Design a protein around this ligand. Structure first.
Ligand SMILES: Nc1ncnc2c1ncn2[C@@H]1O[C@H](COP(=O)(O)OP(=O)(O)O)[C@@H](OP(=O)(O)O)[C@H]1O
Ligand SMILES: [Zn+2]
Ligand SMILES: [Zn+2]
Ligand SMILES: [Zn+2]
Ligand SMILES: [Zn+2]
Lengths: 289, 294
């Protein structure tokens, strides 16, 4: 009955956890490292430079992170749904052959260039719609997601056509945020090991939390730089889409340069900003052939 | 009672300045940096301007806030007439013996200055003996240590506690306005000669340059005056009426040399010089004299 409320709340636990670490990291770097440690030293130039630079990375990180969480994933348009007449004929029908004929007649009026592994029309039983190309159903979001990449638990949201560029920038600014911390706390991490009671706990934690997050998230970032240039989602990287000419891992590829511009766009000024600049509408995609 | 009315109406200059500063933040960030500069298609200057602007905007609002809410220092309870001395002072009818009551108390205090008539500097309202450089302000309704002047733009007195914050407030005001004027100028040129014609951005970019230039030219004169007062170790009051010591009036009676005079306000630790954090030497109730006696 009330299982929805607890299920919905527990989904925010990874978000609140990450949010706490970021708030703690701000307190640790600004107060403990810059004010108590670096400003505990008589160097006002080094303290200000770090504080200014830190706020630039911290803003780009929180901005990208926020956008990846609250950008709702796009769903298929009204045209892909079975009308109340045709969905009755589909539910009334018992022969799979005639079921496929119902779906094929509506789908041929839609920009669909892919089929299932069994060359059947990609259809969603729960949503009662014909899945657009690259779209998949997520049982966590309980919906079909356009150009679905994966349901990322750390943002309590699906990473799809709307989220993807924000998700990528979130990864990018995560490495930069953590690398900058590790590179600047290192000079003082060496000193802390080789004596303030409170400052050491936060500075010691600061260096290897930033390092652990760097070495971990860096693997994912290199993974997606492959994916963007190949024009493949994570789902497609495990199951290549099947076109009219058979399976093709490169069926949506337009070349390395043009594949990136499908995600980041043609406006060069928006590439590094968590502002939506992805080409297309998510319900149809340019084909290689 | 109009003292209640004074408290509310006193915030009008503060709220007015707050409006101009909030408006300046919106105008420079949204209208100038987002609509105008980022429309020109290169985010290299936009990030630099947005980063630099936030450095000056923070130091300006920080200094302004500190000058407003730093309560002015008052004389210690030793400078107040005790319940014994207030009686015999009130009983006396001869002014000559009244001074002797104040003189006997003043000689137990680190006081090296008198009035122009060589009488003990005494406050009738607070019923205390004014410390050196301290003055009574009827707006604050109190005696202010090393009082410089009552400032309406901060709804507060600029005294011993405020002065370095007030100075930083002036400094970061000039820098904030100079940075705005120097960066908006190139785009101020465009709007008049119609290289840019946006309706909303024009009002804010034009007003940004005028208001920043008008505030710069005005505050710069005041700032240079106070840079000279600090080197002379003189409050604004003292620069018009030199204090009277045991050896007569002396405009330089509190001077300790140019270097040491600045250190009285900003301190010896350079890391606090530019920061709105209290670093002034002394206690405000006594000050080193040039000749002898502290
Ligand atoms: N109620 C007040 N409001 C504003 N300023 C005051 C007030 N009372 C004294 N002052 C300041 O102190 C001076 C007034 O006379 P006093 O030297 O006796 O000071 P005081 O009575 O406050 O201790 C004024 O400065 P000026 O004569 O050199 O122009 C004034 O700035
Ligand atoms: Zn679905
Ligand atoms: Zn999902
Ligand atoms: Zn008084
Ligand atoms: Zn006052």
């Amino acid at each position: 009955t009330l299982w929805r409320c607890c299920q919905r709340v527990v989904g925010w636990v990874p978000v609140l956890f990450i949010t706490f670490v970021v708030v703690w990291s701000y307190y640790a770097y600004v107060v403990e490292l810059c004010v108590f440690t670096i400003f505990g030293n008589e160097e006002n130039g080094k303290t200000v430079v770090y504080l200014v630079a830190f706020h630039l990375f911290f803003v780009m990180f929180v901005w990208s992170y926020w956008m990846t969480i609250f950008t709702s994933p796009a769903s298929p348009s009204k045209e892909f749904y079975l009308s109340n007449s045709e969905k009755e004929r589909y539910e009334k029908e018992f022969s799979q052959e005639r079921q496929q004929e119902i779906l094929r007649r509506a789908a041929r009026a839609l920009p669909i260039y892919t089929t299932s592994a069994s060359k059947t029309i990609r259809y969603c039983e729960k949503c009662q719609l014909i899945k657009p190309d690259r779209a998949h159903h997520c049982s966590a979001c309980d919906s079909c997601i356009l150009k679905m990449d994966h349901h990322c638990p750390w943002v309590n949201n699906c990473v799809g056509f709307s989220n993807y560029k924000f998700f990528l920038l979130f990864l990018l600014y995560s490495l930069l945020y953590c690398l900058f911390v590790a590179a600047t706390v290192l000079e003082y991490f060496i000193k802390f090991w080789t004596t303030d009671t409170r400052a050491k706990f936060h500075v010691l934690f600061l260096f290897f939390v930033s390092a652990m997050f760097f070495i971990s998230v860096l693997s994912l970032f290199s993974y997606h730089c492959w994916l963007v240039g190949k024009n493949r989602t994570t789902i497609e990287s495990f199951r290549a889409p099947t076109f009219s000419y058979g399976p093709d891992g490169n069926g949506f590829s337009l070349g390395c340069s043009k594949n990136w511009r499908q995600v980041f766009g043609d406006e060069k000024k928006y590439w590094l900003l968590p502002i939506f600049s992805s080409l297309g509408d998510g319900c149809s995609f340019p084909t290689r052939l």
